[PDB]
Design a protein around this ligand. Structure first.
Ligand SMILES: CC(=O)N[C@@H]1[C@@H](O)[C@H](O)[C@@H](CO)O[C@H]1O
Ligand SMILES: *[C@@H]1O[C@H](CO)[C@@H](O)[C@H](O)[C@H]1NC(C)=O
Ligand SMILES: *[C@@H]1O[C@H](CO)[C@@H](O)[C@H](O)[C@H]1NC(C)=O
Ligand SMILES: *[C@@H]1O[C@H](CO)[C@@H](O)[C@H](O)[C@H]1NC(C)=O
Ligand SMILES: *[C@@H]1O[C@H](CO)[C@@H](O)[C@H](O)[C@H]1NC(C)=O
Ligand SMILES: [Ca+2]
Lengths: 305, 307, 305
């Protein structure tokens, strides 16, 4: 749907391509090993190394574990994984180790996925950014201590007619079952009562919009050896995610085909239907015949002169 | 600051150096080898082969060995092709760990081959088999396998319960069973008391099999010609623990009389510091009997005072 | 008495496909949330499906489903049409067996959400065995069947249940489905006579009607224009099956030892041993009018005296 009008005089709704929202973009992470010479190793079943007690080095690309390896082609021949600092830094806070993706425009994010290289964190969550420099709201809460960590009901659900914007807490990924390449995925329209009629739901349309996405790794799942505080035990727990998968489209509210990076070094929607703006939110001043509306499937949502 | 404060011994794998100390009443490849395979084999062009466990495993000469004493952790990239294979139609299978002295056990991970066993339980022995405790119960159906055992969330740190979180029906891709003696979050604090110490120190760990998953095809017959579809098999089991020293030294020297010039084993003899004596440093040494023995916690050395 | 040896019924049987990609020229399929493996340099993350090409990996027909050692066929990408949600797979065993279990595992797609397991004896009438849905709620709304609670158990020998535990999206890659028909039944040890025909069929139909979705299609849908959909957002949705292995016993009441292939009739039939009679070991020879013919049991062969 990269066209405005095919054969008729009136145009139709035009949607952008479903390109990945994390490809070839640098993600900012609070922590990153490599400048400190630090060794670590756990049960080596993840890869097959005899000990895997090597070091994180920033100067060695073949040994670095920074945020660059997080987003990439995700080739199955040689996966690239970002690794945080181990428990030597003591990763258990009221705060957390947070990594945030910057996009520069509102994107129609549909799903979020992660590929845990080493283990699923016991308690972690992923956050939103409705508008630039705006407040954060969460997608979903994965924790085995829903009532203790976030004080929320485990395996929560939203009934019909309720506030579907509010997130939930569930223990779907709490036990470290895969221990290698753990797949966790969340979709924006999962469990929403108004999902079927989402095209006529203003609340979902605004809520699904996102500019930046961050993950709050609250608690790191541990075997239970933290009591001894052994140095080998201390370095045997860490965070490692190999793929940061998030899907979305350049949200111009269905009034543009493609978004092109102009000389301002910022993305702008090539708005059609006599509109201009970051998301085609306003029609041209000469074309204020009718109020602006979302590009519904049935209608075209154009601005007459 | 081991001398000024307290340093705890490093925790490592137990199987390294203890591979020969494995026992089980279920091993294929006996004096009469027999075929053993399961439905839905994908990566192998041939359906299955013959178990031959009369020789220790070799990369090329003996690639079909399935002894319990040859299975190790992922030491080599050939981890995918080393494991032990049980017999046909076995319901009471048991494996155990043999320890020279009392060790500390906290958790074990076993990567199964075909199916997580229907019934799984751990048997505890803190006095070299004189008593027989239990850790936890795993069952596909708790009441069917272990009736009278509570099922659900955590109740107590040291309470035996039955959980189905590790007895699923889709373990083919090297599925493993997670067990933790001490909960990551349900532990209020570290008493370091005999109540928790006697419930954590282990002389001979015991793993028992009570049931095996059935796909329904073998429930209509009692013939030996079809029992080979169902069997237990573990890619690798790893047990992490440390030499018990009451928090005096951060390491244990190799056991005397052992000539293993390898890096990785975990011993059970602690050198004595802060004026103490004994195999595990359980008593103050000479001229320092003035104060009673006390454990070392945090930065408190709690060294025995001179008489 | 003595059932014949186990044989994989799916290996030597014919399989029919309702629709597979590649038969309509080239076809472009993008993995749901992830990129293509890096063998072809490919920013547009679709491997080219094909049906008539020189590269074996390009072609993905159903002739690689069971007979292939490790391969798969994928349903055509919905960009061709929305009607491709309903795809049926037929298992042509050519003879009536005693099916005990079925194994289905995907290759590069989530396990199908809504799909039925229909049996057949006469080749015309089809009776389903188990019902599958994306959620336990969908079982009551769509199939009007109460889903089972906790572990999948049978309250009756001939009961039919709707199980959603095998439709979870968590096993995104190589998701597995293990269906049992005897375990958990009240007459589990002794196969009840009514359970015999319930577990006996000649054709097993793997009717797939709905694909498991991450709400990608629901984000962009056009009810008014059903023939105009965004190719990119729908190319990520398709079925994929890589193994339909099935096992069972020959239906001759366990009065044989094996079921070797017969060159005379091109059919697989057990031998009529243990003093049995008839072409299919389903009768007793003349001279035993005192004892009417009846099938044997597990405990004894029940000779025709
Ligand atoms: C992820 C998010 O929305 N906000 C986090 C906040 O919770 C955290 O305290 C801070 C430092 O860790 O980083 C940011
Ligand atoms: C990412 O974008 C930059 C900007 O042009 C380009 O130079 C680089 O090659 C791109 N890398 C990938 C992997 O697409
Ligand atoms: C297992 O059980 C069978 C019969 O129930 C018995 O003959 C056999 O000795 C048992 N073996 C073990 C190791 O318990
Ligand atoms: C396409 O496939 C058909 C069979 O499905 C074949 O007859 C035809 O030659 C093929 N077209 C080619 C190879 O160009
Ligand atoms: C076979 O597929 C077509 C679409 O290609 C669909 O309309 C039809 O319903 C399917 N067959 C059955 C029996 O559902
Ligand atoms: Ca990567």
């Amino acid at each position: 749907m990269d066209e405005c009008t095919d054969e008729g005089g009136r145009p139709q709704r035009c949607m952008p391509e479903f390109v990945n929202a994390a490809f070839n973009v640098t993600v900012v992470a609070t922590n990153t090993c490599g400048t400190p010479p630090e060794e670590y190793c756990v049960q080596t079943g993840v890869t097959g190394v005899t000990k895997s007690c090597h070091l994180c080095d920033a100067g060695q690309p073949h040994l670095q574990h920074g945020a660059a390896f997080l987003t990439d082609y995700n080739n199955q021949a040689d996966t690239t994984w970002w690794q945080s600092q181990t428990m030597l830094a003591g990763v258990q806070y009221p705060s957390s180790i947070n990594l945030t993706l910057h996009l520069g425009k509102a994107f129609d994010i549909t799903y979020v996925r992660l590929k845990f290289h080493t283990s699923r964190p016991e308690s972690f969550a992923i956050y939103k950014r409705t508008w630039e420099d705006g407040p954060w709201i969460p997608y979903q809460y994965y924790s085995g201590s829903c009532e203790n960590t976030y004080s929320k009901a485990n395996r929560g659900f939203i009934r019909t007619g309720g506030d579907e914007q509010q997130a939930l807490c569930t223990d779907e990924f709490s036990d470290i079952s895969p221990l290698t390449g753990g797949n966790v995925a969340f979709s924006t329209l999962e469990g929403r009562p108004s999902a079927y009629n989402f095209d006529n739901s203003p609340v979902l349309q605004e809520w699904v919009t996102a500019t930046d996405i961050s993950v709050t790794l609250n608690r790191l799942n541990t075997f239970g050896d933290e009591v001894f505080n052994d140095p080998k035990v201390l370095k045997s727990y860490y965070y490692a995610i190999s793929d940061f998968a998030v899907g979305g489209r350049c949200k111009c509210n269905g009034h543009a085909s493609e978004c092109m990076k102009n000389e301002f070094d910022k993305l702008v929607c090539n708005c059609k239907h006599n509109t201009y703006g970051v998301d085609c939110e306003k029609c041209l001043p000469f074309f204020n015949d009718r109020p602006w509306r979302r590009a519904t499937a049935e209608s075209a949502s154009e601005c007459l002169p | 600051g081991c001398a000024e404060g307290s340093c705890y011994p490093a925790t490592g794998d137990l199987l390294i150096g203890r591979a020969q100390k494995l026992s089980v009443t279920s091993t294929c490849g006996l004096h009469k080898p027999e075929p053993y395979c399961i439905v839905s084999h994908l990566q192998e062009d041939k359906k299955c082969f013959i178990c031959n466990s009369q020789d220790p495993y070799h990369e090329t000469l003996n690639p079909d060995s399935h002894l319990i004493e040859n299975v190790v952790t992922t030491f080599a990239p050939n981890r995918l092709k080393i494991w032990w294979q049980s017999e046909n139609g076995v319901e009471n299978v048991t494996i155990q760990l043999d320890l020279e002295a009392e060790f500390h056990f906290t958790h074990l991970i076993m990567t199964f081959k075909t199916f997580r066993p229907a019934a799984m339980l751990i048997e505890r022995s803190s006095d070299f088999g004189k008593t027989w405790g239990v850790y936890r119960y795993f069952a596909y159906d708790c009441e069917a396998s272990f009736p009278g055992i509570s099922t659900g969330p955590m109740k107590k740190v040291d309470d035996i319960i039955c959980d189905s979180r590790y007895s699923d029906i889709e373990p083919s891709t090297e599925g493993e069973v997670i067990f933790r003696a001490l909960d990551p979050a349900f532990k209020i604090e570290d008493p370091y008391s005999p109540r928790i110490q006697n419930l954590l120190k282990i002389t001979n760990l015991r793993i028992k099999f009570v049931k095996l998953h059935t796909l329904g095809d073998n429930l209509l017959d009692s013939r030996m010609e079809i029992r080979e579809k169902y069997y237990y098999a573990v890619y690798d089991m790893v047990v992490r623990g440390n030499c018990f020293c009451y928090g005096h030294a951060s390491e244990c020297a190799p056991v005397d009389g052992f000539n293993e010039e390898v890096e990785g084993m975990v011993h059970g003899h602690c050198m004595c510091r802060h004026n103490t004596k004994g195999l595990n440093c359980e008593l103050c040494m000479d001229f320092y009997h003035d104060l009673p023995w006390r454990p070392a916690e945090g930065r408190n050395s709690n060294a025995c005072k001179k008489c | 008495g003595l059932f014949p040896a186990i044989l994989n019924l799916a290996t030597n049987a014919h399989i029919s496909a309702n629709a597979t990609c590649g038969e309509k020229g080239p076809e472009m399929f993008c993995k749901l949330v992830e990129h293509v493996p890096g063998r072809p340099v490919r920013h547009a993350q679709c491997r080219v499906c094909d049906g008539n090409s020189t590269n074996p990996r390009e072609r993905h027909p159903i002739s690689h489903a069971i007979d292939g050692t490790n391969n798969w066929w994928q349903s055509p990408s919905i960009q061709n049409g929305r009607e491709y949600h309903w795809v049926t797979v037929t298992l042509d065993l050519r003879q009536v067996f005693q099916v005990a279990y079925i194994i289905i595992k995907a290759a590069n797609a989530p396990r199908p959400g809504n799909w039925i397991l229909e049996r057949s004896v006469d080749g015309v009438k089809f009776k389903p065995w188990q019902y599958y849905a994306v959620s336990d709620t969908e079982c009551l709304t769509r199939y009007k069947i109460t889903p089972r609670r906790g572990p999948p158990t049978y309250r009756a020998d001939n009961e039919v249940i709707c199980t959603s535990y095998y439709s979870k999206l968590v096993p995104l890659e190589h998701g597995e489905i293990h269906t049992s028909l005897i375990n958990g039944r009240p007459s589990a040890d002794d196969p009840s006579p009514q359970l015999l025909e319930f577990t006996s069929a000649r054709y097993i139909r793997l009717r797939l009607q709905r694909i498991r979705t991450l709400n990608a299609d629901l984000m962009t849908l056009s009810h008014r224009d059903l023939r105009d959909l965004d190719p990119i957002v729908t190319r990520r949705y398709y079925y994929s099956i890589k193994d339909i292995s099935v096992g069972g016993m020959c239906i001759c009441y366990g009065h044989a030892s094996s079921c070797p292939w017969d060159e005379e009739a091109k059919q697989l039939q057990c031998q009529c041993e243990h003093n049995t009679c008839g072409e299919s070991c389903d009768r007793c020879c003349p001279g035993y009018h005192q004892q009417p013919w009846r099938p044997g049991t597990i405990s004894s062969g029940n000779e025709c005296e």
